[PDB]
Amino acid sequence: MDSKQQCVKLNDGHFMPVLGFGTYAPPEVPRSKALEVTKLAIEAGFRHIDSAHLYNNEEQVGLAIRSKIADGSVKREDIFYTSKLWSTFHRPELVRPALENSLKKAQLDYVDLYLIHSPMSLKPGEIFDIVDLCTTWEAMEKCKDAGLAKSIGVSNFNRRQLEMILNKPGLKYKPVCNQVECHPYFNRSKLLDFCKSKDIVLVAYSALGSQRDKRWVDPNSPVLLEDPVLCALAKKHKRTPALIALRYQLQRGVVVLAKSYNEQRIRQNVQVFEFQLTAEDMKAIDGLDRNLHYFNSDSFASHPNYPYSDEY
Ligand SMILES: NC(=O)c1ccc[n+]([C@@H]2O[C@H](COP(=O)([O-])OP(=O)(O)OC[C@H]3O[C@@H](n4cnc5c(N)ncnc54)[C@H](OP(=O)(O)O)[C@@H]3O)[C@@H](O)[C@H]2O)c1
Numbered sequence: 490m491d492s493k494q495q496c497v498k499l500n501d502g503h504f505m506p507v508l509g510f511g512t513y514a515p516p517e518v519p520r521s522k523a524l525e526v527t528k529l530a531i532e533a534g535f536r537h538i539d540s541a542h543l544y545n546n547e548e549q550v551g552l553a554i555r556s557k558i559a560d561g562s563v564k565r566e567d568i569f570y571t572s573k574l575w576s577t578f579h580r581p582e583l584v585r586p587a588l589e590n591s592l593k594k595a596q597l598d599y600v601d602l603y604l605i606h607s608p609m610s611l612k613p614g615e616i617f618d619i620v621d622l623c624t625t626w627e628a629m630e631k632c633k634d635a636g637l638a639k640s641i642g643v644s645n646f647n648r649r650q651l652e653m654i655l656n657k658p659g660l661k662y663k664p665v666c667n668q669v670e671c672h673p674y675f676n677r678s679k680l681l682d683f684c685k686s687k688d689i690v691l692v693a694y695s696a697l698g699s700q701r702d703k704r705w706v707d708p709n710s711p712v713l714l715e716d717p718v719l720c721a722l723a724k725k726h727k728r729t730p731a732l733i734a735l736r737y738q739l740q741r742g743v744v745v746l747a748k749s750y751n752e753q754r755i756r757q758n759v760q761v762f763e764f765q766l767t768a769e770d771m772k773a774i775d776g777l778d779r780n781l782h783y784f785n786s787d788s789f790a791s792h793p794n795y796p797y798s799d800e801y
Contacts, residue, residue, distance in 0.1 A: 491762035493534045496569075497744065499665040500688040501633075503601070503640045506569050507739060508761060509537035511694065511748030513544045515702055518750065520549060526750045527553030531563060534759045539668075539694075539746050541573035541606055542591055551595025570597065573606035573644060574629070577613050579620040584628035588637050603629065603638035604668055607645045609792040617792055622650070623657045630661045644668035644692075647796040648683050655687060668692040670699075671743060672713055672734060673774050674781035679801035681743065692744040697731050699783035700748065706783045718773050726764055735761040737774045 496504040510530040512523055523546040527538060531553065540550045554570060557563050572595070578587040588603055605625060610618040629641045642664040643651070654664060667684055671677045671693035684691045698713025699706055713719070719730040726733070731747070731754070738745035739761060747758045766774070782797060789795055 490764075491739075493759060493762050494536065495762065497690060497742075499640055499690060500663050501640050501665055503665070504569075505602070505640075505666070505690065505744060506537035507744050508535065508735070508759070509539050509569070509571075509692070509744065509746040510535040510755075511746040512538060512540045512546055512550050513700070513748060514546070514750055515700065516545075520546065522750060523549035524553050526755065528557060529752055529755050531557045531568075533756045535755075536563070536567055537569040537571070537744075539571045540595075541571075542575040542578070542587065543573065543606060547572065547591055547594035548596075551597055555596060565597075569601040570595070571602040571604065572600050573604040574625075576607050576609055576611040577615060577618075579605070579610040579618065579622065579625045580613055581624045581628040583613065584625060585632055585635075585637070588632050592637065599636060599639060601639045602642060602665070603632060603640075604642045604644045604666075605629065605646075608643075608650050608794040608796060609645075609789065610794065619793070623653060626654050626657065633662055640665045642666040642668065642689075645670075645796055647799050648680060648801050649799055650794070650796060651683070651687070651689070663687065664689055666690040666692045666744070668694055668746075670695045670782050670784060671738065672696050672698055673716065673719065673737060673777040674698075674711070674713060674779050675783075676775065676778045677801070678775075678778070681741065683801065685742070690744055692746065693738050694746050695783055696738055696745045697734055697747060701783065705786050707785060710781060710783060710785075716777060718777055722766070722770055722773065725770075726766075728760070728764060729757065731758065732761055732764075733766070733774070736764065736766050737771065740766055740771060
């Protein structure tokens with residue numbers, strides 16, 4: 490079996506656990522649930538915890554972390570906590586205060602990772618905004634220099650959006666990661682190759698096929714975990730389709746998130762470290778790639794900085 494504490498070194502010298510706990514739940518789920526399930530996740534062995542301003546759960550997630558520190562289960566340095574800058578805060582003067590507010594919500598001194606949530610800028614408050622993300626990035630760099638974030642990265646960027654940052658004059662810090670939709674139906678092979686070539690970690694969200702939220706996802710879309718190839722592999726290994734989907738990412742060198750608000754499934758998901766897929770299994774999963782991103786709404790596709798038009 491693998492070690493549950495497996496991590497990879499980021500391009501700034503910090504370390505990221507390769508399995509992360511996804512904390513988003515839709516608004517119909519009471520806010521208090523995030524507290525309970527984040528503690529369960531830590532109990533089960535998750536150390537990388539993924540939150541965001543958008544999730545309206547930072548207080549609950551922060552309290553769970555601090556509760557597990559206070560009772561001696563973990564130390565702060567054992568936890569890798571991520572938050573994200575929401576798209577109405579892209580204007581550079583709004584970036585550091587947004588992080589400060591996230592830190593105060595979680596009652597933490599620092600985040601391990603702060604991401605630009607999305608390249609699709611939205612007007613402060615709110616429609617679409619036009620912001621040079623290089624200016625947003627410079628403000629992110631200042632957050633790292635001040636120690637508010639140990640590491641900084643991006644999310645939902647394509648190759649060209651990454652290149653704009655990487656080629657920026659006077660760049661101080663490369664993004665450590667690009668957190669993107671990634672699963673066997675949309676495996677991001679070319680983007681993965683590019684990220685690897687630049688010492689940028691690809692972090693997979695919706696690795697289990699997304700929460701299929703009606704705001705963002707077509708109910709007609711095939712359900713990832715119902716896929717016959719994933720189910721046949723689950724049968725072969727006497728695992729579950731979810732575990733096959735998570736293991737696939739680990740064997741590609743992708744850091745993988747998994748959201749569950751169910752005690753049994755939270756505990757199940759850490760078993761990703763407990764088996765392997767063969768080369769032939771991995772080939773079978775690669776065959777599933779079909780250019781299906783579950784997040785697929787007019788609200789994204791019509792945006793000037795929508796990442797999905799380019800080849801990768
Ligand atoms: N950067 C971004 O724009 C972005 C976008 C999407 C997500 N994310 C992050 O990534 C996290 C995960 O992605 P996601 O929210 O799309 O969900 P996901 O990890 O793809 O999970 C989808 C669903 O799978 C179910 N599940 C979990 N374990 C299972 C298992 N072992 N067997 C059968 N079903 C299982 C969960 O339902 P139950 O809760 O009922 O178990 C969950 O709702 C998010 O919570 C968030 O932290 C980021």
